[PDB]
Amino acid sequence: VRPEDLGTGLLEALLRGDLAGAEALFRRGLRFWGPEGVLEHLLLPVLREVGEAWHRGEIGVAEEHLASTFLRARLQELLDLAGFPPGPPVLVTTPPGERHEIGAMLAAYHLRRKGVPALYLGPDTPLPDLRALARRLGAGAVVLSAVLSEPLRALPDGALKDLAPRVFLGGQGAGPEEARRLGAEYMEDLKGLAEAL
Amino acid sequence: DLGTGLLEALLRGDLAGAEALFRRGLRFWGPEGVLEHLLLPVLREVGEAWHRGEIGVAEEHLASTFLRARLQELLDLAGFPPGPPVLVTTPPGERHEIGAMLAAYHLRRKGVPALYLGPDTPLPDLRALARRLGAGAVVLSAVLSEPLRALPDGALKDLAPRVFLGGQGAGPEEARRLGAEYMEDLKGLAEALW
Amino acid sequence: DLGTGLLEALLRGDLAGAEALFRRGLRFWGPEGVLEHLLLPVLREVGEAWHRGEIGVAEEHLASTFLRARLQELLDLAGFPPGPPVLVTTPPGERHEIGAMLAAYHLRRKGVPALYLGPDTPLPDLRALARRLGAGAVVLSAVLSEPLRALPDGALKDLAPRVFLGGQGAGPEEARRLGAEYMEDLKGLAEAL
Amino acid sequence: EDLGTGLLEALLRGDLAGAEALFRRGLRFWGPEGVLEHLLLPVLREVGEAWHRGEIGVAEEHLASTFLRARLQELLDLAGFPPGPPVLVTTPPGERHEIGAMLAAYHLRRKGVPALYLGPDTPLPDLRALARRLGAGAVVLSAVLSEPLRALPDGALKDLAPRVFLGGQGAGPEEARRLGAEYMEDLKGLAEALWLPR
Ligand code: B12
Ligand code: B12
Ligand code: B12
Ligand code: B12
Ligand SMILES: C[C@H]1O[C@@H](n2cnc3c(N)ncnc32)[C@H](O)[C@@H]1O
Ligand SMILES: C[C@H]1O[C@@H](n2cnc3c(N)ncnc32)[C@H](O)[C@@H]1O
Ligand SMILES: C[C@H]1O[C@@H](n2cnc3c(N)ncnc32)[C@H](O)[C@@H]1O
Ligand SMILES: C[C@H]1O[C@@H](n2cnc3c(N)ncnc32)[C@H](O)[C@@H]1O
Ligand SMILES: [Br-]
Fold this sequence. Notes:
Four copies of one chain form a homotetramer.
Chain A: H1 6-15, H2 19-33, H3 35-55, H4 61-81, E1 90-93, H5 102-112, E2 118-120, H6 127-137, E3 141-145, H7 150-153, E4 167-170, H8 176-182, E5 185-186, H9 191-196
Helix pairs in contact in A: 1-2, 1-3, 2-3, 3-4, 4-5
The structure holds cobalamin (4 copies), 5'-deoxyadenosine (4 copies) and bromide ion.
Bromide ion (BR) sits at the interface of chains C and D.
């Protein structure tokens, strides 16, 4: 399997319910592209394609579920293999109503890969509870991944302003203007998140 | 005890400590044992503590996310045996997924190819996937009762030749209404087709 | 069972089997755990079997090379954070490198930028590199005692602002003689930094 | 190209992340065989020459070599390990340069040969014993220095396995003849030579 065919091979393995094969193809990608690379060049393209294929009516929700659940597990495995250093944590989650979690996981991963103690909470955290936990742990930052725009639209002006000393918002659902309205620092690239920290 | 220590380590955001305590549990009780003696009690306690107002949603999220990751690791350790799969998910509207994962685990430990889909699968899409993979069975975990009451009579009938429904949200009457076989305990799930 | 399975798989040249067993161990014990409970015991057993005359050097080589590769894979998966590095190597004349790799791994897993150099680094060259990179520490793994004895009193004193020595070849007395801080456990190395 | 200089520069600044990104870029551009030919091999040679000229110290070479060995080992595992009678790959007694042997194992694996890399510096009787016990079809040796070959007696490599191949900058046709090994210049033609009779 040539690298440029790994994406289709992996999706095909998943759609035949061949998890073992899917795992082997993912690992080949990991060995070729490296950890950050396999996420960029294999995990993300497959997931986007899964979304487009669902939208065109080529696959159903259950096939997306299968693929997403599998890729989340692969990313979680990489996350546990990265360091978890000591010191004030960075809490990573998604806004209330946002159930797409892989962006948040990616953010947490890229941070840990740079030696930042990113605590991934899971998705969909109410803001008062998030604020309270950041406070109690002395969190240096809160990072939010927004895939959809609607959950940000549902929040009032300034809603993200006091969650932690620094509050970062990114993802396809977020933009500079909405981040300003909400009182968060906008971040375009995962790479520049650790730098900013 | 390990249960309190693990919860305490999670609530301090000490993941390394939490991981070490979980591994100790795993090494002592073994795979099935650590679920029964450590993973399940901590999750229940997290629920009760939230309900009493002792912890907030972010603490529950942290603990649940951690334990889901540990259970997924056990799922991959159990292995994924070959042959026609058994699809495992939760009803539409059901976001609690650890019960489904548990079902998949117990099945895999008995050599059943339990394919965990993730939670919250619309029934037509589930039916379609069972059909395309030639699935022998479908297993649903219901933690809440409400998602089952929202479903039409007979809605679980014929998703596969065998359809099983269990969890704290499910009962015999609702399973009959929906056209599923009710199952009380995970232990008797692999027996039902074995 | 995994230790015996893994050694048996290696001695039959079944690398695929060996890889699967190691991953099983990794999933069960976790990363630090699989090194402690699987990599280390297998390598000790390899050494004892060689010492008894039961296996030749080629079998040990096969097993060692395999386990080094597994550890290197884990090392690359750990973070490499920014900032002043910690250089990790072995004393001149020390060709057993897996202890050093372990030290680098445990450090990286705790967010320390441990640069593993490989084994067997002359002290002047090591000192020079620590200086030029502004390294906060040097860590040395000694498996044999002989490369340390050879060394003069206070040979390790100024390699970097902090210098740590550990491994089965090292002890408190020899560390004091050499001007290094002795460390018994890998766990307490990141703490000390 | 100049990925080579960039990579060496990143290594000498202790920027492993940068070094890894440059290597990956090379791997994505040239492909697996290509990145070895265009990036891994040139950097290693240059490291050697820079040490010899007094421009870098031993610690810098160690850092770079350790890094590139790790990258090559990753490619080895990516080439895969096929079933069937193995080919044992190592270096002669006294030979501690191992990357040539790893390269040989890689090129063999990329052609579907189960090349078992032992690591370097294997005593000949022990190697012969292991080849025999595993039913190895061949042994492959990489010699970087000439001295370890010079130390061996006539015919020493002859019967290590049914076929014995010797290559590397330390080896030549006459020394291979003296030692009873088949000489091989280029790694690409190694699988071909092995599938063919002697
Ligand atoms: C799997 C999936 C789901 C899963 C999520 C599973 C889970 N537990 O995570 C489930 C089943 C829950 C789901 C449900 C739905 N989702 Co959906 N699905 C996806 C899918 C296929 C993959 C999502 C993913 O992980 N992709 C990877 C994402 C994270 O990559 P990315 O956004 O490009 O992220 C990049 C950057 O943004 C950056 N980044 C991300 N976060 C952050 C944060 C920071 C700080 C920084 C610096 C960078 C950064 O990192 C990435 C690098 O490229 C996408 C398809 C797609 N194109 O994304 C949709 C998609 C996002 N979903 C969509 C829809 C419509 C839905 C539903 C409304 C469908 C429905 N009718 O029920 C629901 C809504 C649920 C909700 N959130 O409330 C649409 C969104 C269209 C839109 N924007 O309007 C998509 C695009 C599919 C489509 N083509 O229609 N979904
Ligand atoms: C974590 C958690 C969540 C998480 C889920 C995260 C995830 N999975 O991705 C999140 C944050 C999403 C969540 C949200 C909510 N949940 Co909640 N939470 C939990 C908690 C603490 C653990 C859930 C869990 O892992 N299940 C534990 C399972 C393993 O429970 P169990 O009883 O031990 O299950 C046994 C058997 O049922 C059997 N089994 C399970 N499934 C099956 C299937 C088969 C076939 C068989 C044979 C056996 C079997 O296996 C287990 C053996 O011990 C529980 C507390 C609890 N006691 O369950 C609630 C709990 C279930 N949640 C509850 C509530 C109220 C909610 C919310 C409505 C809160 C809100 N207002 O937003 C939402 C609703 C979401 C939804 N639509 O589903 C309540 C339910 C009360 C009720 N009405 O019955 C609980 C009980 C908390 C409480 N103490 O009040 N929750
Ligand atoms: C593989 C191996 C080799 C390989 C090394 C391959 C490589 N790394 O590239 C090679 C082939 C080179 C080799 C050669 C030789 N070695 Co050898 N071999 C081993 C073996 C089997 C495993 C070594 C290993 O990696 N073990 C795993 C390590 C990680 O375990 P560990 O050292 O106990 O480390 C633990 C602690 O010390 C701690 N730690 C380690 N470093 C540090 C550093 C710090 C700062 C801290 C805090 C902690 C710490 O962490 C680890 C976990 O608890 C051991 C057997 C054994 N029992 O060790 C010998 C062994 C060490 N070798 C030995 C011998 C005899 C030799 C040779 C002299 C044989 C010969 N050629 O004649 C040569 C000498 C080479 C030299 N100059 O160093 C003996 C030494 C006994 C002694 N001291 O008297 C051993 C014990 C074998 C035996 N039973 O006889 N060897
Ligand atoms: C890193 C390195 C080391 C490392 C080895 C690390 C390891 N692998 O574990 C260490 C630090 C151990 C080392 C030490 C020493 N080495 Co040194 N170093 C190197 C270096 C840079 C290795 C580069 C390499 O991996 N070569 C492999 C590739 C890059 O080069 P290559 O051999 O041309 O490979 C091609 C072909 O030969 C072919 N090939 C190789 N093997 C095989 C096998 C077959 C079957 C086939 C078909 C083809 C084939 O493939 C390649 C392209 O097609 C070389 C520099 C160099 N130019 O090679 C020296 C070099 C070989 N070392 C040298 C020296 C001097 C030493 C020491 C004697 C120094 C010392 N006094 O301590 C010791 C001796 C060690 C020993 N063998 O006992 C000199 C040799 C000069 C000479 N005598 O001819 C070199 C050439 C550097 C130099 N010019 O100063 N070294
Ligand atoms: C964005 C992703 O959301 C999933 N999706 C779409 N509709 C639903 C639903 N009602 N319930 C669950 N998941 C759904 C699809 O699989 C799509 O690919
Ligand atoms: C059953 C679990 O659901 C979580 N929970 C309760 N309310 C919400 C909400 N609005 N959003 C997300 N999770 C919530 C709690 O943390 C509880 O422990
Ligand atoms: C400590 C390890 O050193 C290895 N060992 C012992 N003698 C030699 C030799 N001549 N060459 C290479 N390795 C050797 C053995 O395989 C032992 O297991
Ligand atoms: C061929 C390579 O050998 C390394 N080299 C040279 N002398 C020594 C030594 N005493 N110990 C270890 N490595 C050494 C150099 O770094 C050179 O680049
Ligand atoms: Br390696």
